[PDB]
Every structure is written in structure tokens, then in C-alpha cells.
Design a protein around this nucleic acid. Sequence first.
DNA 1: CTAGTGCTGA
DNA 2: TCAGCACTAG
Length: 626
Amino acid sequence: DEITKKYIKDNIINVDDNIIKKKDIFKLKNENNEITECAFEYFESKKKFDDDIESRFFIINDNNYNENINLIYKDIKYCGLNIQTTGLEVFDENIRLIQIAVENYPVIIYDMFNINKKDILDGLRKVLENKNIIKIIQNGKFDAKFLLHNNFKIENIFDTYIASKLLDKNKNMYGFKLNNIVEKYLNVILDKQQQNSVWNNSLLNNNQLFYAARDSSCLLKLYKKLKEEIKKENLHIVNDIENKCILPICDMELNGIKVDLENLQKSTNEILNELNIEKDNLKKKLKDENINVNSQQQVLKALQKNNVRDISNKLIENTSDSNLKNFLNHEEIISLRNYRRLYKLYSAFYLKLPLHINTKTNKIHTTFNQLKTFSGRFSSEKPNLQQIPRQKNIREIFIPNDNNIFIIADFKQIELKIAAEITNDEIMLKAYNNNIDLHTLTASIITKKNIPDINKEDRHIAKAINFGLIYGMNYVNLKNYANTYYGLNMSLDQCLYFYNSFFEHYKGIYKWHNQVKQKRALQYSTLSNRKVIFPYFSFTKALNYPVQGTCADILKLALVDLYDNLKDINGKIILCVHDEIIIEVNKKFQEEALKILVQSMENSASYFLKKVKCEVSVKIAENWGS
DNA sequence: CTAGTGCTGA
DNA sequence: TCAGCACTAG
């Protein structure tokens, strides 16, 4: 039909009319700073949209290309960037459209599947690569991944999703989509009713492209309002750190971590054989061949039948971990706990990892979020690399690529040092400046011994108590935390003495607790001014948000600096979990990468914390579990 | 024979 | 998060 092929030469198919090809004379400055009149071709919606957002759009392909269109990019400061892709997986999908939105101009849509002259993208590469031009994106991680994977270099970025998330102060988890944000801040409905229309086809319908253009032009007005809103709330530091942390995260996701298939198979066979042996032993002990070991009620009934009792001659009724500890003087329950451990490992990690390794490259690629967590720390999904077992044997599976070497660096006592800085405790700072660990100090003041005499067990009691009480746990509740997560058995009188002694000397933390509990404020802030508003008062969250948020800020600034400092030796950032950062470098640059990483982490720590000097433990490792 | 909720730990 | 196990419905 002639109506549907009116603009087929530009790879546009007309569905419901509502499209007109119009030519107008534009005014632009030549490279020599001379106003040169140029005539372009742009498409417009025949039926005007009720909103004020821009809807005109160019389309640049192999034939329609005009050399003077690059004059739009000259002497700009912000540009709206949005890309449409054939699918979500970066490795199995290509980029369909690149969209650049420039103020008081139509959006420029690059038809990637119909571009073959590499000079067509010459100006796009410069406008993306320039550090003085701010690129506005929605969910910038996705677009940055897709652009970097396709040999585009992107340097500056301003994610409207990040600004919207920070401004809401973690009040709501859902929302924060382009329609929601634009409705909230501009009072305009984008009509995002496109149900993920077909993009793989070379021809694209009218409504698809007009939805694409309005999703890009609206980012300029959102930038204008959100910049002022961030400046008003003094969130510019956190916003800048987060925006610059997009590229490190995308680099981590693209690089991934390699998996040794041979060692993985060997470990899987060994663990499965051990599981079978333990299952047979438990079957013999439970005296029920048909019993399903995994069934909770069945094992409860079996143990009840066998009549394993307490020291108080009390029978078990729940197989929770805390309950199982009380009953340990029988072989049956020991075998049951061992089997539970083995089964948890086998069914959580070994059998689940092969679903995540890509056979095309033999690597695990993770999805890193940076604002879903309440504290602000990174969170990983699909393969939850934070949920990997911490045992040395398990982590030995992960290895660097061929002809490379890992460099693992992690902070020491970062939460405690941040707490000392924020609360301004007189004694903690003076201790740290003399090179004594706060765990050692806590152990010494508890045990009344001098610093040299502290053993490892006292250090362990200190490790429990310091993390226990800094976040406001009551002395009664210290028992459960100590026994559950460290195995120490403590008498409540001993806990009372520990609490009194701990808060008698560290005056700063006591004053901090008193102020936070007296004020009962609903708004809290970190040292990067990342603000959060809780629905109601929560003492533990109140005392925990500042330190952990500042730790997240320190790690993010470290990644931002490290990504720039590693470009000389082609280092690859692989992972960032807890207070740990992993980078792979070639074996020739083994020595320099260590100094680069140490300097980056130390500068990041010293930017925020000023009283205390942070130290980093770095080791050159052949594999993760070294 | 397939669907689910509802409930219990690792 | 993640897995798995008794109890309603055709």
C-alpha cells in the first residue's frame, strides 16, 4: 500500500499515518565560527501531542547522511542519550538505535542496522567520549554496557534514575521508571503503552520511533529540574560519585570472573560422594530406609522415635540451627547437621553455578545494583556473588584468565574506623594513629592485660563485642549475637560487665547513642550526605545507616578512581563484594597494579575520613581463594 | 496426573 | 534466597 511505504527509503513504515516528512532551513555555526545555513530533513507527528515534550526526530542512515549534522554537537554541555536494543542480554543482542537529544533541536536517531559507513558515527564517538559534555540516560548501566561492548567509549554520564532514587530517600522501592519520574517532576504522561514491539526487523513503525524520541527529549527537562533539586538538598557529592561509578560497574559486568571447569567437576563429584556417604550413615542411624532426609517433619518424627533428649531429658521439637546446638552429645544429630551442611552446599552452589557459566566464554557474568540496598552498598543478583560460600576450597574455583593474575585488596575495620571518625571518639582515634587495631584495644580493656599479651581468642571476643555494641544491641541481646554468629557462650553477668566497661571508656559512641535515642529523628545522613527517611524510628537502623553508607561511598569512590588509574596497564575490575575489590592484570604489570590499587583505595578513604588513616591488605593471588 | 498455598529450615 | 514437603482441585 502506498500509504504504508511513503517513507520506505528511510526505513520507516507508516502504520496509522501520523507522520510527515518536512524540510526546514536551520542556522548552525561552522567549525570556523561562521553561521552557515543548512537544510535538513525531519519527521513530525501529524497529530500534535498534548504535552510540551519534543517529538520531532531526524533519522540518519547510510544514504540520508549529511556531513553538516555534526554541527549540532558543537559547543554543547548536555545531551540526552538513549539507546534501543533488540533484547536485554548484551552478548546475544545488538543495538538497534542510538538517540541524541540536544536542546532546541530535534532528536537525532541513528539507524544502526542501516549504517555501514563508519564515518557516520565519527561525531557520535566524540560527543560520547568528551568529558565536558554530560550524557543524560535513564538506567545508565544498561546503555553503558551496550555501548562499551560495541566499542563505543563513554566518559561522562548523569543517570536520572540515580537522581530520582536519591531524592526519594528510600521511601518507596517501586516506581523510578521514566513514566513515573516524568509524571512526578514534569506533570506529563509519556503514554508508554508500547508493549515491547518488534525491534529486530530492519523496518520500524512510526509509533515505535516517536515513543523512542519522546523518551530521549524529556531527559533534558528532567535534567534541568533534577540538578536544581539535588543542589537544594545538597546531594551533589553522592550523585557525582554514583554517576562516575556507572562505568566501573558496567566494566565489572562485562569482564566477569572465570570458572575452572575441571576443578569444578572434581569438587562436585567429591561433594556428591561425601553427601551420599553421609546420607547412608544418617539412614542407618535413623532406622528408616524410606525416610526422606530433606523432609523436615519426617526427620523430626524420626528423631522423636529415637528419643534423643536434652541434658534436661527434654525431647527435640524443632530442627532449627539454634535448637540443634543444644542437642549435640549424640551421633545421630551430628550426622544430621553434617548432612544439612553438605546438602546446603551442593544444592545452593555446585548445582546452581553451571546454570550461570556462559559456555561461549566460560565465565560468570553478574548484575550489580547500586541503590537497591538500604545502606547503599552494592548488591549482586542472578549469581549472587555475595552468597557464594566463603570457604577457601569453594573460592579456589574462580581463577583469572589465561596469562593474568589476580590482585585482591580489602579494607581493615572500615566500619569501626568510620564510626570512630563520625562519633569523634577521643580514644579510638588516638589508638588508630598509634597503629593498634581497635579489636586489640577492646580485647585489652576487657581483659585488663597489656597490648602485647593479647592472644587470638581475646581478639575473637573483641571481634564479637565491637560489632555487637556499636550498632546499639542491648546487653541481653549480645548473648544471641555472640553465640549464633561466633559460637562463644557468654553468661549474662559477663555481658553486663562487658557492656559497662565498653561504654565507660569509649565516651564518643555512648554520646552518639544517647543523642540518637533522645532525638528520635526520622531522617539520617552519611558523610557523603546520602539521606534516608525511615517510616518510623528504628534504633539499630539509625545507628547502622551512617557507617555502612559511608563504607559504600568509600568503595564507590575507590572504584571511580581505580577505573581511571588502571587504563595504563589495561587492568580489569572483576568484582566488588563486602569491602573487597578484585582486579586482574597481566603478569608483567604485577607490581605496578598493586601500588595503583593501594593508592586508589587510600585516596578514596582519605577524601571522606580525615582523622584516621585507612590501610589496605593487598595480596597477589593465583586464584580467589588464596 | 498438573496446578498452589502454607510452612519449615540452610 | 532458596529449597523442599503435606493438603485443596479437578
